[PDB]
Amino acid sequence: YLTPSGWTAGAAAYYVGYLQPRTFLLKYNENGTITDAVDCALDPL
Amino acid sequence: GGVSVITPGTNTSNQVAVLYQDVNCTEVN
Amino acid sequence: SVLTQAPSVSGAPGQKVTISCSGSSSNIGNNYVSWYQQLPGTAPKLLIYDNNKRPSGIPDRFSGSKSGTSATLGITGLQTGDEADYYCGTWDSSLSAVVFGGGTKLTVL
Amino acid sequence: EVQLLEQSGAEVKKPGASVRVSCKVSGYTLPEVAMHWVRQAPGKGLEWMGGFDPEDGETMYAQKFQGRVTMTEDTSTDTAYMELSSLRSEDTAVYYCATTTPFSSSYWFDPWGQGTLVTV
């Protein structure tokens, strides 16, 4: 409004990451949901 | 050269000892 | 119109004098008071709205207050180009419209 | 902030006619500011008229000038027409266009367009 054109309401923050073609391990559950996921090109373990 | 990982059980710890076989780490604690 | 304010008031330069507006509970009591300024042969410019809020481009030297049925426009630091007519205006629930005062032709000596 | 355009301009008519007042806007658009109007006769005071109601979302009209004065709005080209009719003697005056905030609860007319005289 007339604040004693006009935009910028609220405050905005988000996150951006990029994807890479790298092997992953996927531990499915008894309900078929992914719980554990360990990378392959991350560290020796 | 080969890269072989020495580990105690993951449940015991997550520390790792990387042994490079057929390679002196002059190359690459 | 229905409101009450003197047609003209006089004062010295750089001194302190306010301008009053006598109304009723039907127009000032339950509604907000606005003060406008107009120069000879020009357009009325809003001085103050609600008597405690200043529009964009209004000096901080202007103030106002609402004492029951009366509304005072406090005018501090009068200048030479301050001589203009100030209009008191309020909403009306009796007529349910926009009403104004007679106007105050202030004169800075 | 906002640049208000001319409302009608130089308009002169002999007795027995009718004239519109199309208040134009720039910097904003039409359905984001409420319209209002003020009669201002030369050597007289203010006489509020027209208006958009912050409550009811309706476009007001002066109770003293009901039926005689009407208004339409074209939001794209932002033209707010104010139609006069039934010309009388004391009708000649400056017809100011003004505006209040879109949301609600505003009595002030901060931007206006220097008004328009008519002819009787």
How far does D79 lie from chain C, in Å, by closest CA? 22
Residue D81: which domain range?
3-117
**CB pairs A-C closer than 8 Å:** 6
The helices-and-strands tally (H runs, E runs) of chain D is 0, 8
Question: Does A5 contact D at CB distance below 8 Å?
Answer: yes
Residue C25: which domain range?
8-108
What 3-state class would DSSP assign to B17?
Answer: strand
The CA-CA-CA angle for residues D41, D44, D48, to 5°, reads 65
What are residue B3's phi and psi, to 5 degrees? -125, 110
Chain D contacts of C50, Cβ < 8 Å? 107
Give the pair of three-digit tokens for residue C48.
């103050």
Q: Is residue C1 part of a domain?
A: no
Domains of chain C: total: 1
**Spatial distance between the Cα atoms of C45 and D97, rounded to a whole number of angstroms:** 14
DSSP letter assigned to residue C43 = P
Q: Which of D101, D117, D95 is nearest to D2 (CA)?
A: D101
Give the pair of three-digit tokens for residue C82.
């301050």
Instruction: State the amino acid at position A18 in one-letter form.
Output: Y
CATH classification at residue D43? 2.60.40.10
Domains of chain D: total: 1
**Long-range interactions of B4-13: CB distance < 8 A, separation 24+:** B5/A44, B5/A45, B7/A45, B10/A45
Instruction: Check if the beta carbon of residue D1 is closer than 8 Å to that of residue D9.
Output: no
**Spatial distance between the Cα atoms of D59 and D52, rounded to a whole number of angstroms:** 4
Q: Is residue C18 part of a domain?
A: yes
Cβ–Cβ below 8 Å for A44 and B14: no
**First CA to last CA across chain D, in angstroms?**
36
Per the listing, tokens 């001319």 go with D6
Q: Is residue C26 part of a domain?
A: yes
Instruction: Check if the beta carbon of residue D16 is closer than 8 Å to that of residue D87.
Output: yes
Instruction: State the amino acid at position B13 in one-letter form.
Output: S
Resolution in A: 3.6
Chain A contacts of C56, Cβ < 8 Å? 2, 4
Chain B contacts of A44, Cβ < 8 Å? 3, 5, 16, 18
**Spatial distance between the Cα atoms of C86 and C69, rounded to a whole number of angstroms:** 18
If 0-12 CB within 10 Å is exposed, 13-18 middle and 19+ buried, where does residue D74 land?
exposed
Within 13 Å, how many C-alpha atoms sit on residue C66's CB side? 23
Beta-bridge partner residues of A39:
A24
**Spatial distance between the Cα atoms of C61 and C39, rounded to a whole number of angstroms:** 19
Cβ–Cβ below 8 Å for C95 and D109: no
CATH classification at residue C63? 2.60.40.10
Instruction: Check if the beta carbon of residue D81 is closer than 8 Å to that of residue D72.
Output: yes
DSSP letter assigned to residue C4 = B
The CA-CA-CA angle for residues D26, D24, D79, to 5°, reads 120
Q: Is residue C3 part of a domain?
A: no
Question: Does A10 contact B at CB distance below 8 Å?
Answer: no
Q: Which of C12, C9, C16, C11 is nearest to C88 (CA)?
A: C9
Beta-bridge partner residues of D81:
D22, D72
Question: Does A43 contact B at CB distance below 8 Å?
Answer: yes
Instruction: Check if the beta carbon of residue C95 is closer than 8 Å to that of residue D37.
Output: no
**First CA to last CA across chain B, in angstroms?**
20
Instruction: Check if the beta carbon of residue C28 is closer than 8 Å to that of residue C35.
Output: no
Chain C contacts of A2, Cβ < 8 Å? 55-56
- D touches B, CB cut-off 8 Å, minimum 3 pairs: no
Do you know the residue count of chain B? 29
Question: Does C53 contact A at CB distance below 8 Å?
Answer: yes
If 0-12 CB within 10 Å is exposed, 13-18 middle and 19+ buried, where does residue A42 land?
exposed
**Spatial distance between the Cα atoms of C88 and C101, rounded to a whole number of angstroms:** 5
What are residue A29's phi and psi, to 5 degrees? -105, 180
**Spatial distance between the Cα atoms of D75 and D77, rounded to a whole number of angstroms:** 6
